[PDB]
Design an enzyme around this catalytic site. Sequence first.
Site, PDB file in Angstrom:
ATOM      1  N   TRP B 142      -6.131  -5.574  -4.833  1.00  0.00           N
ATOM      2  CA  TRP B 142      -5.209  -4.030  -4.712  1.00  0.00           C
ATOM      3  C   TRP B 142      -5.643  -3.256  -3.605  1.00  0.00           C
ATOM      4  CZ3 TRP B 142      -6.545   0.974  -7.047  1.00  0.00           C
ATOM      5  CH2 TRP B 142      -5.439   1.763  -7.227  1.00  0.00           C
ATOM      6  N   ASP B 224      -8.680  -4.599 -14.679  1.00  0.00           N
ATOM      7  CA  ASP B 224      -7.394  -3.689 -13.921  1.00  0.00           C
ATOM      8  C   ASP B 224      -6.236  -4.314 -15.149  1.00  0.00           C
ATOM      9  OD1 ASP B 224      -5.278  -2.627 -12.732  1.00  0.00           O
ATOM     10  OD2 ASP B 224      -6.440  -2.494 -10.891  1.00  0.00           O
ATOM     11  N   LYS B 260       4.071   1.162 -14.363  1.00  0.00           N
ATOM     12  CA  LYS B 260       4.876  -0.153 -14.373  1.00  0.00           C
ATOM     13  C   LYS B 260       5.525  -0.465 -15.590  1.00  0.00           C
ATOM     14  CE  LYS B 260       2.003  -0.197 -10.567  1.00  0.00           C
ATOM     15  NZ  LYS B 260       0.367  -0.461 -10.413  1.00  0.00           N
TER      16      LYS B 260
END
Lengths: 396, 414
Positions: B142, B224, B260
């Site tokens: 990321w 994550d 999301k």
Amino acid sequence: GMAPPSVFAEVPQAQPVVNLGVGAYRTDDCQPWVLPVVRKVEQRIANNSSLNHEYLPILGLAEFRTCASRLALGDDSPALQEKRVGGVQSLGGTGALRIGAEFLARWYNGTNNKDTPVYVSSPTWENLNGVFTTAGFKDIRSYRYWDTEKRGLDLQGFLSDLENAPEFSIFVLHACAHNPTGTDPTPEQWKQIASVMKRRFLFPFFDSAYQGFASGNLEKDAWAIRYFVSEGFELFCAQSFSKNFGLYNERVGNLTVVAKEPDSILRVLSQMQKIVRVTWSNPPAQGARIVARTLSDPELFHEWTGNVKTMADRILSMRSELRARLEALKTPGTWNHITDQIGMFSFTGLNPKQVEYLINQKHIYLLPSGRINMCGLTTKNLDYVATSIHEAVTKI
Amino acid sequence: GMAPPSVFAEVPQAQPVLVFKLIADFREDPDPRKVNLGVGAYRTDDCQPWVLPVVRKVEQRIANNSSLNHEYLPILGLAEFRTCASRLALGDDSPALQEKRVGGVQSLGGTGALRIGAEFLARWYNGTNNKDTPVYVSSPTWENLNGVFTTAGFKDIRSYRYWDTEKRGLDLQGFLSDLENAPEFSIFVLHACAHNPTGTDPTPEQWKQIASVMKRRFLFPFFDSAYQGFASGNLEKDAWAIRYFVSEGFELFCAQSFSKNFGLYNERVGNLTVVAKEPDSILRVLSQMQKIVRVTWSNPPAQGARIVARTLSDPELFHEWTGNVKTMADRILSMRSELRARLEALKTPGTWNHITDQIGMFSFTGLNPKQVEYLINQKHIYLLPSGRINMCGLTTKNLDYVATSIHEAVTKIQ
């Protein structure tokens, strides 16, 4: 040893940190108050199905940042007309202070200079030292401010501490409604403070958590910030909308930056963006949407100023009433500080000894410093509070 | 006589961020065939953002409830949100929940959860104020991860092999070697599912091999979890690796985002889940988390956490939400299947099973930088120089054009 040791096995337990100890507005019925203008704007938002949830820009909702900086600086601010102002939406006033502190610790007074002295008032907001220490500043200092004997501003001490501060030191200045004392410099005193800061290149980092909420008038409460701007200072101003909009839990703040010219704003904001990106990525929308809608609609703005003055007037009433009851009750000492002070919070002038009495004999809860939240006083408890203060002063 | 220079006169202009200008160039482009495969969020087949129906429903319920106030939440956040969020990640039947050895800190999205966790580790993990513990991140990872851990004070950020360019998938042997060579107590940031940016995830059997090395070398898992449910449609499958590590006795952190899977990007809803060996340490860890939060954002915002808490705590809303998540996951699965089918029907050189083997909205296509340049400059298809695409940028209407353009890039460029 039967099992592998916990990686948390040595983590310490952090130190533990009528109710006059609240830190938020309360009605005469001891209740929270969602501002009528906020309820109205929330319904408009809920009825607008075109609003989406896509990420805001890193620096925040543009209309909010503009409206917030205009609120602090004034619509006709020359700094705004000259395009030398930036605004970073932040997570309350706390987040604005933190982003500003991070920026200064990286880019001010050299590169990565953690040694620039940071001066805070004695006493000050309890979280301020932690914010600047976490940003990496190694040398946090205090300036004299509260005079316990006069129950007011120690101007000569403050001025001496400004005169003795190394050039380029940062001063965190409460713009109005000083927390926790409620004692603010008068405009003439602010002019003396500004004169030393100008001469010694001291950086004003204003904390404006109570604008309009403080005196009932948003324009008067921003005067000191605007005076520094008019005197040609570059400065930061950490704004909170937690108190004056009652939006505590929506975490609405803005960091206003005033520079000498527009290009500096662009470079500063570009570094701000990097700081924000690794802290919260981009800020939440709901509270900023409420503030932006309110400040950009003259009718909503007018309604909001009324709601703010309602809160300030209830506090001003509690201050006027408490002093009158204490003076009527032959209470020793002077009590004009109760009405000379400004904002929700009042340093009463009571030592811890007198404070322990009110908590264990009378069950008024206040801090050992003697700080009370005037929003904890009501038409129903005032005579009980005032009498109990009279016993705390004359017996203990 | 001369006005002094600004105290900001030596502040440099930061480097431009590529993805920002890519989106800007896309908006400018006049060509009606243009496609934005660089978008960073879910989009419908009509190229639009999608507010989840369950979110609109809960927002209306919140708006109609005049008893809710705006008073500060606790520093650590809304209690029901924290409990529901950790239960979603760990499963209702988690041994760690049964044993009361889980904590949860509400955070400003997944970013805020990563940041608070990193700040905690840099102060209390592997010693006191140990900034030298290696932090390992995937190659690639990321885009903001390195900055989060660097700002938290870590001085030694390292990469583990992950994306294999030749094989278009996971370099398992390189990853395992980098684990085997990592100093004891090193921190590994692990994507729980739907790896961003590649879309390549370890299979369960590969996760078992990764966990075996980490257990033996006392390597700390910092998960994550930004795409639970969003990734595959199945909330349990998407949490399998986290839950496997818990079952294997690991202590871990898990930075959860609801940006999301709830579409709540701009309400900044996240949670840091902490799994400890013993219940008594959760209180101590959380007391330090409180100090970190206090000086960062003081306390977290309410609106997004209220929406998530209400949805996860009510069976009817939860079921509606799982359907909304499946809608998103299924659209992405469809675009992957349709793109792969078209690339194979065009007999495009190379293998394309990675297009459907990958998981989530992001895909490393395997296109090289010159091929990416061709797609942008000649075909008005916008994507990152790495070859990353967002599958949500594909639609029923643009699939033929995108597949044809990729075939041209592969056969004509480089």
